[PDB]
Structure 1
Amino acid sequence: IAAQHLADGIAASGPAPDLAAAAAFLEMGDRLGVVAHLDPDRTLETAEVAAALDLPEPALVRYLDAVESAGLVIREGEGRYRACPDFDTIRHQAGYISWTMNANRPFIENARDFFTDWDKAARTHVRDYREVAVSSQWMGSHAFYPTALATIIDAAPRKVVDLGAGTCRLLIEVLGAVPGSTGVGLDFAADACRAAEQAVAQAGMTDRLTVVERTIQSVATDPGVLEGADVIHAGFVFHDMLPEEEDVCDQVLANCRESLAPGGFLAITDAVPYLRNDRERRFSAAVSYYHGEFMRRRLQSEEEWVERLRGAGFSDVRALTLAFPTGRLFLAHR
């Protein structure tokens, strides 16, 4: 009786216990600053990491021994832990869970308020931008960042502009692979711009990569920084301007097309709404419902994106399916 109930229960639970445990351990560890020190090819030394993160070393060791028991890290002698061989895949998968269950938690917990008075709910139940950013990065590691990276590099560009560059991690990697290429990181957050400037100095690309503290919307009035770019990148940034800033968005796209060097392209990664195919539908619906219902940010279909980009003067647009469910890469050629 109990053996039959055992196999059937194991099949019914499937991979959910493992993913549930991985996501909780990794979100907890990431908030503590520990996950950044975990890597499959090197150890973290507890005596040093506890001092660097201002944590009591015995508490850090109890956390690392629990994650070791979980199989997420390997104890390599006293006070040294290495991430398990497939850690980066586990962290990638945890990113989806973290994004839906942690970053978007204000929407899960207060839906009744958003249904009653959206304007009051939207200003009261605010997402933690750090959690949105980290969970997005983890989802991106294996499901959208490699495609955008390889597309920009294989074009062998002389000048690359990244709209919403953050800490300029993509631009630093593109310049390291393309000799003599220059870049321009555009981002409004002062915190992200200061961090980007110190990361370019470490990479040795201060002369090659310029960081500008300004909005995506300012590119509509002042497009100078875009001139002569072979590639312009815009990762999940345009839907934040829609539907309230449609005219500014269209002037930014028209300015991107005219600014491009001959043969240059604009590469936009964005989420398309409510797909029906079996692989993408579930996560597509969560992405779409969070954007449409809770954030009131307009996601455009492929057809809409192509119509808008051709309206901006782009001669041809190619849409590519990304592994990120509901994610599409649009390459708009000048």
Structure 2
Amino acid sequence: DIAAQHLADGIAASGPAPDLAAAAAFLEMGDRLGVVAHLDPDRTLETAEVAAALDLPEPALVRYLDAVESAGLVIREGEGRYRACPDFDTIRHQAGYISWTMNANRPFIENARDFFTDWDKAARTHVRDYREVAVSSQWMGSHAFYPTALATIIDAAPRKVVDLGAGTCRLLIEVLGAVPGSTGVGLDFAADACRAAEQAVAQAGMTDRLTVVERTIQSVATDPGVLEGADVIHAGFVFHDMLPEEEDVCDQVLANCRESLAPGGFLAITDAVPYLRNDRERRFSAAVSYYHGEFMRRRLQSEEEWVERLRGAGFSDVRALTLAFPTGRLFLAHR
């Protein structure tokens, strides 16, 4: 009788945490192996072929997939064939938040004492794995920021679209595929990301429309030529890296963005605003804010600071839109 009461009380106390904890660990483990990229609710993963492609022993891969099937994350369709559960993309999205705070930002969790005593020594010793930062933020973005930026670029029907920090040019290839007769300039300093975006642009069929330029966003303050005539300039979570050290460079990048825009054009920036108080956003906002401010020393600006800076760059009007990503804001700065 007492065991039944403790059972109902404990289920209410645990809530959704055991499911989320299990999903995040299985998905991070599978992503590091390269397995999660082959999991999709509309098609099967064939173990014989995937084990060869990923260079894993097939028995070990089958035991991983059988544990993930027992968890309810995949369905065994036939022998050696597994399909993701129908709500897989939502589970992967939620796992993104746990991976970001517990995996991508792990050096900060484990070595906080070092950061509090000698920040400069700690900042160069305990560094984040950039592949984990990239995958976890892509998972968070899938349902919480990427579709708002995507629908905003597309519905403006642009002739030219520029992406500052384009990465693998996924947003640029999707906007070009939906807007008939549009060109795009993908800007990213990484040679590894640019070479991957170059091959992805060719297979999509837009090698003449999409120009990949291996350059830093800070180089746009000196050379804004590639921005000229753009209808939409996109910048997703790339400006706070410059603040507060490269403040004047960042201000020049924004001023160049405004002058370069074609009539009716806009600069669409998505960024994180610091320490919100509202109940829905406050907890994740505080984690994003503390990791940026305390551990990375990157300046996050409020909506008011952002609007003032964007008006100081010549922009006539600035609109702020709340994103589902807690503490995330989309600023549309009209020329």
TM-score, normalization: structure 2?
1.00
> In 2, distance between residues paired with 1:49 and 1:245?
45
**Post-superposition CA distance 1:16-52 (Å, at most 9, x none):** 0000000000000000000000000000000000000
1:76: how far off?
Answer: 0.3
**Post-superposition CA distance 1:183-227 (Å, at most 9, x none):** 000000000000000000000111000000000000000000000
> In 2, distance between residues paired with 1:213 and 1:207?
16
Structure 1 consecutive aligned stretches of length 4 or more whose deviation exceeds 3 Å: none
Task: Tell me, yes or no, if structure 1 residue 236 matches structure 2 residue 264.
Answer: no
> In 2, distance between residues paired with 1:147 and 1:8?
39
1:329: how far off?
Answer: 0.1
> In 2, distance between residues paired with 1:244 and 1:300?
14
1:94: how far off?
Answer: 0.1
1:14: how far off?
Answer: 0.0
> In 2, distance between residues paired with 1:73 and 1:289?
36
> In 1, distance between residues paired with 2:153 and 2:214?
23
1:174: how far off?
Answer: 0.2
> In 1, distance between residues paired with 2:182 and 2:229?
12
1:126: how far off?
Answer: 0.2
1:121: how far off?
Answer: 0.0
1:313: how far off?
Answer: 0.2
> In 2, distance between residues paired with 1:205 and 1:316?
33
**Partner SS, residue 56 of structure 2:** coil
**Post-superposition CA distance 1:147-179 (Å, at most 9, x none):** 000000000000000000000000000000000
CA RMSD of aligned residues (A): 0.2
**Partner SS, residue 329 of structure 2:** strand
> In 1, distance between residues paired with 2:44 and 2:243?
45
Aligned to 2:215: 214
1:230: how far off?
Answer: 0.2
**Post-superposition CA distance 1:255-297 (Å, at most 9, x none):** 0000000000000000000000000000000000000000000
> In 2, distance between residues paired with 1:77 and 1:298?
52
TM-score, normalization: structure 1?
1.00
What percentage of residue pairs aligned between the two structures are identical?
Answer: 100
Aligned to 1:201: 202
Corresponding residue pairs, total: 334
> In 1, distance between residues paired with 2:255 and 2:223?
12
Aligned to 1:134: 135
Gaps of 5+ in 1: none
**Partner SS, residue 133 of structure 2:** helix
Matches within 5 A, 1:17-32: 17-32=18-33
**Partner SS, residue 297 of structure 1:** coil
Aligned to 2:7: 6
**Partner SS, residue 320 of structure 2:** strand
Task: Tell me, yes or no, if structure 1 residue 171 matches structure 2 residue 176.
Answer: no
**Post-superposition CA distance 1:78-117 (Å, at most 9, x none):** 0000000000000000000000000000000000000000
> In 1, distance between residues paired with 2:122 and 2:203?
42
**Partner SS, residue 206 of structure 2:** coil
1:63: how far off?
Answer: 0.1
**Partner SS, residue 68 of structure 2:** helix
1:13: how far off?
Answer: 0.1
Aligned to 2:303: 302
> In 2, distance between residues paired with 1:206 and 1:319?
34
1:67: how far off?
Answer: 0.1
1:11: how far off?
Answer: 0.1
> In 2, distance between residues paired with 1:180 and 1:10?
55
